[PDB]
Structures are given as C-alpha cells and as structure tokens.
Design a protein around this ligand. Structure first.
Ligand code: HEC
Ligand code: HEC
Ligand code: HEC
Ligand code: HEC
Ligand code: HEC
Ligand code: HEC
Ligand code: HEC
Ligand code: HEC
Ligand code: CA
Ligand code: CA
Ligand code: CA
Ligand code: CA
Ligand code: CA
Ligand code: CA
Ligand code: CA
Ligand code: CA
Ligand code: CA
Ligand code: CA
Ligand code: CA
Ligand code: CA
Ligand code: CA
Ligand code: CA
Lengths: 99, 106, 106, 99, 106, 106, 99, 99
C-alpha cells in the first residue's frame, strides 16, 4: 500500500482499540496495524540515511505492536490497550522528525 | 500477492543472494524477501483452512513469519554495514525456518 | 566433557534463559552454552562413527555447530546491550538448529 | 541529591509546565527538570548492562529536556509545552521496566 | 557543590585519565567529571553575578557545559567499548571546551 | 592547494552544514572539510616558515589538524546514521579547534 | 584449557600449516586452531570492557580460521596457507594491546 | 592527486621505512605515507556500502600510520619500524577485497 493507507490503517485501528470491548476486537485491530507497519517497513539513489532512519522507526513500531498483540493473546486486555496508547510515543516521534 | 507467489519471491531472492557479487544486489533481494514475508504473515495456508484463525496452529504459523522477518531484518542490517559475506550467511540460515514451517504446515 | 554432557548443558542453560529475570543470568547461561557448543564442534556422534572424519556428513555435522555458535555469539551481543527480551528470543530460535541437526544425526 | 527527590522535582515541574502561561515559567521549570535529570544520570553490579541501560535512559531524557528548553528559549512556548508532555514516554518506558 | 570544587573535580580527573592504565579507571574518572559538569550547569560564576539569569552570557555559559557533558558522554562510550586510547584522547579534546569557557567567563 | 583556500573550504562548508536541511548535504560538506583538512596537514603556515619542520610548534600545528580530522570523522558518522541535528552540532564544536589553532599560529 | 595451551596450540599449528605438504595436514592443524580459539573465546566483576574487547579478538580469529578451513576443504591448499599467514595480523594485534 | 599515485607513495615509502637507519627517514617516510592515505580517504554508487567500507579501510590505515609516527617521534625507531610492517595487513585486507 501507499503510505497514506498505512497511516489510515494505523490511525483507524488505534481508535478501534481505544473503543474496543473484548479481546477479539483488540487482536484484530493490532493485526491490521502490524501488517500496515510491515508493509510501510518495505518499499521502493542507493538509499539515504533518512530512509534508513525512517525504516527503523517502523521496525520499532512493529516490535511494539507485536508485544501488544502478545498481551492480547495472553488475555490481558487492559494491558494491551495501554500499550496501544504507548505506541503514540513512536508515532509522534516520527511525525515530529519527518513531517 | 498470493501465498504461493510470496514463496516464489522468497525462493528466487534466496538464490539471488547466493550468487550475488555486490552488496546492492543483496539488499535489493533481501528487501523483496521482507516484503514477501510481510505479505505472507497474514496468509492462511491450505492445511489450516479448517482451523480457527485464533487456533494455536494459526498462532504458530504466524509466529514462523514473525521469526523469518526478524532474520531478514538482521541480515539486512549486515548488508548495510557492507558485511556481504555475513549477510549471505544469515540468509542461508533462513532455510532452517523455511523448513521448520514447511515440515508442519506445507 | 562428553557430547551427551554438552547437550545437557545446552538444554539446561536454554531453560535458564527462558526463566531468567535479569541480564547477568542470561549472559552466564549463554556463555555456558557457547563453551558447550565449542566442545561439541569436535565431537563425533554415534550415527556417524562408521563415516570418514572428512565425510560430507561429518562436514555437515560440524557446520551445524558452527551455525549454533554464531547464533549464541549474536544472542550474547544482545544481552550485553542490555536487550534481555531480544536475547531470550534469539535464544529460543536456536531450537530450530538444535532440531535440524537432531533430525539428521541424533 | 536523593533519587526520590529527583523524580519528585521531575514530576512536579512537569505539572508546572502543563499549568504555565508565559515562557519564563516553562524555561524555569524545565531548567529544574534538567538539573534533577543530570543528577539522576549517575543489589545489581556497578558495571551491569541494567545500569548501562538505566543511565542511557536519563541520557535520552536530558536530550529531550534540552530540546524543549531550546524551543522555550526561542519563544515557541506552545511547542515547548508539547515537547514536555511527550517526555512522559521516556518516564514510563523506564518505569515499565525498572519501577 | 562549590562551582570551584566542581572545577577541582574536573581538573583532578582529567589528570587521572591521562595516566590511567585500564578502562575501569577511565570510566570512573569520566563519571566523576560528568557529575561535576552536571552540578556546574546550574551555577553562576562570579563574573556574571550582576547579570540576569536570562542574559545571553548565562545562556552561553550554560551551553558550554552542555557541550562539555556531551563530550564526556562520547568519551565514556569509547571507554565502554574498551577503546582506552581513544577515550583518553577524547578526554584531552575536552581541554578546548575548558579553555574556551575560561577565556570568556573565569 | 593554497593553505588559505583549504581554510576557505573549511569555512564555507562549516556554514553550508549550519543551514543544510537533509543529511546528504551534511555528508557532502563534511567530506569536503575532510579533504581540506587532509591537504592542510602538510602545509607550513607563514608564522612558522622560519622554524624547523621538526619544531615543537610544527608538531602542535600538525596535531591540531589530526584532532580536526577526527572530529570531522565523528561528525560524518553521526551523519550516516541520519542524526542530522547531532552531526550539525558536532560540526559546530569543530569551531573550538579552528579557534585554538588560529589563536596560536594565524 | 589454560590460555597458555590455547597459544601453544595456535602457535604449533600455525607452524605445521607453514610446513605442511598436503591438504589433510592443513585441515587438521586449522581444526586444532579453531577449537583452541573457540575455547579461548569462552572462560570464567560483571565483566570489564577489556574482557569484551579481548573476547572479540578471538571471535575475529575464529571467523578467519573458519574461512581458511573452507579454502582447504575446497582443495585450494596454497590459498589456505596464505590465510594462515594472514592470521598473524590478528595474533599480533592482540599481543600488542594486551601483552 | 591520483589514487594510483597514492598507492605508489604508500608502497615506496613503506620500503624506505624497511631500509631506514635513523628516526628522521622513518618520520619523513611515514609523514609522506600519511598524506597519500588522507588523499585516498576521499561503476558503484557514491552512497554504496562498498564505499563506506572502502573509506573506512583508509580510516584504519591512517590511525595506524599516526601511531607509528607517534613512536617515531618518541625515538622508538625500531618499534616504529615494526608498526609499519604490520600495516601490510590492512593493505592486503583491502587488496584481497577491492584490488
Ligand atoms: C515514521 C517512521 C512514522 C511512524 C512510526 C508513524 N507515522 Fe504516521 N505518518 C508518517 C509520515 C511521513 C506521514 C506523512 C506522509 C503522508 O503524506 O501521508 C504520516 C502521516 C500520518 C497521518 C496522516 C496522513 C494521511 O493519510 O493524510 C496519520 C493519521 C498518521 N500518520 C497516523 C499514525 C499513527 C496512528 C501512528 C502510530 C500508531 C503513525 N502514524 C506512525 C510517518 C510515520
Ligand atoms: C511458514 C511459517 C512458512 C515459512 C516461514 C516459509 N514458508 Fe514456504 N511455504 C509455506 C507453506 C504453507 C507453503 C505451501 C503454499 C501452498 O499454498 O501450496 C509454502 C510453500 C513454499 C514453496 C512452494 C510453493 C509452490 O510452488 O507450491 C516454496 C518454494 C517455499 N515455500 C519457499 C520458502 C522459502 C525459501 C522460505 C524461507 C526462506 C519459506 N518458504 C518460508 C510456509 C512457509
Ligand atoms: C548437531 C549439529 C547438533 C546440534 C546443533 C545440537 N545437537 Fe543436541 N544432539 C546432537 C546429537 C548427535 C545428539 C545425540 C548424542 C548421543 O550420543 O546420544 C544430541 C543429543 C541431544 C540431547 C539428548 C542427550 C541425551 O540425553 O541423550 C539433548 C537434550 C540435546 N541434544 C539438546 C540440544 C539443544 C538444546 C541444542 C541447541 C540449543 C542442541 N542439542 C543442538 C546433535 C546436535
Ligand atoms: C529511568 C531511566 C527513569 C526515567 C527516564 C524516569 N524515571 Fe521516574 N522513576 C524511575 C525509578 C527507578 C523510580 C523508582 C524510584 C523510587 O525509589 O520509587 C522512579 C520513580 C518515580 C516517581 C515516584 C517516586 C516517589 O517518590 O514515589 C515519580 C513521580 C517519577 N519517577 C516521575 C518521573 C517523571 C515525571 C519522569 C519523566 C518526565 C521520570 N520519572 C522518568 C526511573 C525513571
Ligand atoms: C564554562 C562553560 C566552563 C567550562 C566548560 C569549564 N569551566 Fe572551569 N571554570 C569556569 C569558571 C567560571 C571558573 C571560575 C570559578 C570561580 O568561582 O572563580 C572555572 C574555574 C576552573 C578552575 C580553577 C578552579 C579553582 O579551584 O579555582 C579549574 C582548574 C577549572 N575551571 C578547570 C576546568 C576544566 C579542567 C574544564 C574542562 C574539562 C573546565 N574547567 C570547564 C567555567 C568553566
Ligand atoms: C591549525 C591547526 C588550524 C586549524 C585546526 C584550523 N586552522 Fe584555519 N587557519 C590556520 C592558519 C595558520 C591560518 C592562516 C593561513 C595563512 O596563510 O595566513 C588559518 C586561516 C584560516 C582562515 C582565513 C582564511 C583566508 O582565506 O585568509 C579561515 C577562515 C580559517 N582558517 C578557518 C578555519 C576553520 C573554519 C577551521 C575549523 C573548522 C580552521 N580554520 C581550522 C590554521 C588552522
Ligand atoms: C588476544 C585476543 C590474542 C590473540 C587473538 C592471540 N593471542 Fe597469543 N597470546 C595472547 C595473550 C594475552 C598471551 C599472553 C598470555 C600468557 O601468559 O600466556 C598470548 C601468548 C601467546 C604466546 C606465548 C604464551 C605462552 O604460552 O607462554 C604465543 C606463542 C602466542 N600467544 C601465539 C599466538 C598465535 C600464533 C596467534 C594467532 C594465530 C595468537 N597467539 C593469537 C593473546 C592473544
Ligand atoms: C583500501 C582500503 C586499500 C588500502 C588500505 C590499501 N590499498 Fe593499495 N590499493 C587499493 C586499491 C583499490 C588498489 C587498486 C588501484 C589500481 O588502480 O590499481 C590498490 C593498489 C595498490 C598498488 C598497485 C597500484 C599500481 O600502480 O599498480 C600498490 C603498490 C598498493 N596498492 C600498495 C598499498 C600499500 C603498500 C598499502 C598499505 C601500506 C595499501 N596499498 C593499502 C586499495 C587499498
Ligand atoms: Ca484508503
Ligand atoms: Ca462499545
Ligand atoms: Ca496478499
Ligand atoms: Ca503448488
Ligand atoms: Ca570434550
Ligand atoms: Ca542418551
Ligand atoms: Ca546525586
Ligand atoms: Ca572548597
Ligand atoms: Ca599510573
Ligand atoms: Ca586563492
Ligand atoms: Ca537552506
Ligand atoms: Ca600444554
Ligand atoms: Ca615436508
Ligand atoms: Ca585526491
């Protein structure tokens, strides 16, 4: 996907998680997020260091998303949603820098 | 793309990395691999179509790609450091993970 | 020590790393693993006793430890960077290599 | 001073930045936050990677406070106010791990 | 502490490093230097007592320690890798910062 | 080249970096600064023409560029990681070395 | 083994390789070396950075030994012996520093 | 100057250090070697990791020449003479790879 979709996806599903009731909604939104992050982490100069640093921010995000999913799969719902709110830290870090 | 199609990409770009002289060929291959592994991570394989998406088998299948993706990330990182021979080695080790998933769900 | 004895050490210290809280426990375990893998690299396993030391099987057996040793080196490196959770993950992935050699020569 | 007293100064002054109106209270409050954070960056061993890690946390924190002061000093108060809120990320990140 | 004694601390340790044999010594010295630099950041030097805490000279004085701190950190890092010589030489480049500030505000 | 023009090159690029937006700019500037510094290493400045090539002042003059070079390298590295701000600020700390040498031999 | 043995081994087998006739003598001496390096790379403070840097020198050595063995296993004898002579570079690097 | 001319200066001056008697020829020859090596450190792309790698090679080489001069400057001629011989390691290492 287009990077803009990847952001729609991440942003949309962040909201879903916040509003979510049960664990199946959380797992499902985070899965969507994980994939968007993975796709955004791979795209089409031999490659600038701002590219390297950009890609790296997605890689962090993925790992964090992945931790959160793990909590949701363990059944810890409360804990998962908090991690999702903690992701914002990384979202804005990037946006500050590259936007 | 298709789960089959992803496996193709992985396998071609594995061979590209064996036969690669220079570091650009290897980044380029590994990146095409990562993209393929990312797409595959969401796929649902034949043998597990009858299973729940939440089944331990589907969990485990997803985990194999999570692993594979980390191994490509780690190999990428080497190729950036210009460590061609290392990155080709880290790539050859992927086959273990390829095989372990195949053994179980192919 | 004995090839069997090495496999013990590996397996105990694999479990230590699963249950480890702090980073010192994990370095300490991984180091005991490395030492064991190093000793094993020269060992000659039962199933291959009839083979030439220069046989492709013995080559391949040695290669599995060479691989395993690199994976412990790489996991060690993470534990030094204080990246406990990563190093425990890199450790769990060893099992693939444990298993691939076992499949063939155990 | 005491590490308890560092964390209090951090927390309190973070609140004062939330509440502040003009650049000078923000400049002042951050200046205090910085001191506490430099103090801080200084059963487990002295050499242990948990301490390399712990210290490195405050190194991040300091860089972030320095930036937020640089904004305050320029007169971008609002932008400084936000830089400050996002510090929490690092606070928590340490807390999650070592609180 | 006495701004003066922070400076005693910086100067003493500068020399310690200069004749240190091993890294553990160097880290320790640098770590004391960092502590001193941190405490120094807040101080008003006698030449600026008359001046506004906001004065451009106080900003410049503060910024001098900020540079100093950074350099100490960069030298610490060279020490943790065990590049003793490289740490020792970083630590000698600090003298430029010492001197620049001193030339303007001592 | 003209020692003077090396210094023109160092000064021009110092400013380039100062107002660069992206990293590719910064690397380029730093790389020119390195080239200039290298060529400068061999030069005799007018104030030392009278002196022995072995003279302690020529050693000290040479050593000033050696420091400078190192700092350029350390700033280059911050640039290749894409820490633009950090590179830009390293590059401002070079001014201390510029000034120290100038104060003594210009 | 004692580090002194590890050195006897490495030194003894370097000489053997130099004097070697056939590929089986080279493979065999390098194998002995590889093992000595591996053992020296693992031994019995939370751990000094000079220790880290020391261990690292062995790790380089192993990788080099391993390349050389590979050439010998391919049949390239001449090439292997040269690599063994190239190892000295690493041997002395360490000795300079730590001895 | 030309990169061919760098490598010649390096090689020739390396020979002059082998042959030298007093500190001044060693000091001089290395001084020349250093210049050539600083020149050098400066179909594949500009940004490529092969060039990061190539350059980094000469960075090593320079550090080694600097050390060997520092010995020469102290009057440890013999020790400088050996520091010089061991440079070959780096020469070859580059050569093996990029000659
Ligand atoms: C960089 C490493 C990023 C991370 C991590 C995240 N985002 Fe992002 N985001 C990034 C860029 C460069 C852009 C601008 C590109 C463009 O033109 O679209 C964005 C943009 C957004 C947007 C709005 C863009 C749009 O579609 O019009 C949103 C809503 C957004 N990003 C949300 C978002 C969330 C929720 C993230 C984490 C959970 C996140 N982003 C991470 C770069 C990066
Ligand atoms: C699971 C977690 C897998 C990992 C990791 C890898 N592969 Fe795979 N692969 C997997 C499945 C379930 C299948 C069957 C697909 C189907 O619908 O039939 C495959 C298939 C392949 C194939 C064959 C495709 C075909 O032509 O039928 C190849 C060539 C292949 N896989 C290669 C491959 C490589 C090289 C991998 C890692 C480097 C790899 N796979 C990982 C499941 C999984
Ligand atoms: C080959 C290259 C191997 C690798 C890598 C690992 N192991 Fe292994 N293991 C191997 C063999 C040939 C054998 C049989 C030994 C015998 O003489 O009987 C083993 C055996 C074990 C055992 C069982 C020992 C016993 O009680 O009989 C265990 C528990 C074991 N191995 C564990 C293990 C682990 C945890 C590894 C990696 C992390 C590992 N092995 C790697 C060959 C190889
Ligand atoms: C580590 C790298 C930390 C960072 C960065 C921050 N904090 Fe912290 N904090 C840390 C520890 C280990 C502790 C426990 C200390 C104790 O003895 O309790 C704390 C504690 C606090 C507290 C509670 C202390 C109390 O008196 O009860 C607060 C209020 C606190 N921390 C706030 C805080 C803020 C606001 C931070 C960033 C802006 C922050 N901390 C960062 C470790 C670390
Ligand atoms: C400003 C940004 C400074 C930096 C950086 C350093 N120093 Fe300093 N130093 C500074 C001042 C204003 C003074 C005068 C203090 C006073 O109260 O009169 C000093 C003083 C010293 C002294 C003399 C100390 C004494 O006991 O009288 C020393 C020996 C000294 N400073 C050393 C020093 C070193 C070694 C530095 C860097 C490594 C350094 N200073 C930095 C202001 C600043
Ligand atoms: C000694 C070790 C030096 C260092 C480090 C730097 N410079 Fe320099 N510079 C030096 C000398 C001896 C001279 C005089 C040259 C002459 O022939 O008279 C200079 C001169 C300059 C000048 C003026 C250049 C001109 O065209 O007249 C500038 C602008 C200059 N130097 C800048 C400069 C910068 C920006 C440096 C570091 C980044 C720097 N110099 C270092 C000796 C030394
Ligand atoms: C450090 C990372 C080393 C590498 C790589 C190599 N050697 Fe070494 N060696 C090292 C040390 C610290 C010592 C002294 C320790 C002691 O007291 O023994 C040595 C010593 C030797 C010796 C003599 C020691 C003895 O047994 O009396 C020899 C002959 C020797 N080393 C040879 C050698 C060779 C051939 C190497 C590479 C092929 C090599 N060493 C690497 C540290 C390190
Ligand atoms: C890379 C990082 C290098 C280092 C370090 C050294 N050399 Fe080099 N050298 C290098 C290259 C890519 C080439 C090929 C250049 C060409 O156009 O041929 C060379 C070449 C030489 C040559 C031959 C050039 C000729 O005119 O035929 C010599 C004699 C030479 N190099 C010597 C040399 C010495 C003595 C070095 C260290 C002390 C050294 N080189 C280091 C790349 C690199
Ligand atoms: Ca859309
Ligand atoms: Ca609802
Ligand atoms: Ca698809
Ligand atoms: Ca098929
Ligand atoms: Ca044994
Ligand atoms: Ca048994
Ligand atoms: Ca304190
Ligand atoms: Ca006093
Ligand atoms: Ca001493
Ligand atoms: Ca001119
Ligand atoms: Ca501009
Ligand atoms: Ca013996
Ligand atoms: Ca013979
Ligand atoms: Ca040139």
């Amino acid at each position: 996907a287009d990077l803009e979709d990847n952001m729609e996806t991440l942003n949309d599903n962040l909201k879903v998680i916040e509003k979510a009731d049960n664990a199946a909604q959380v797992k499902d939104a985070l899965t969507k997020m994980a994939a968007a992050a993975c796709d955004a982490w791979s795209a089409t100069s031999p490659d600038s260091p701002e590219m390297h640093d950009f890609r790296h921010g997605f890689w962090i995000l993925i790992g964090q998303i992945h931790d959160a999913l793990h909590l949701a799969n363990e059944g810890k719902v409360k804990e998962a949603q908090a991690a999702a709110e903690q992701l914002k830290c990384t979202c804005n870090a990037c946006h500050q820098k590259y936007r």
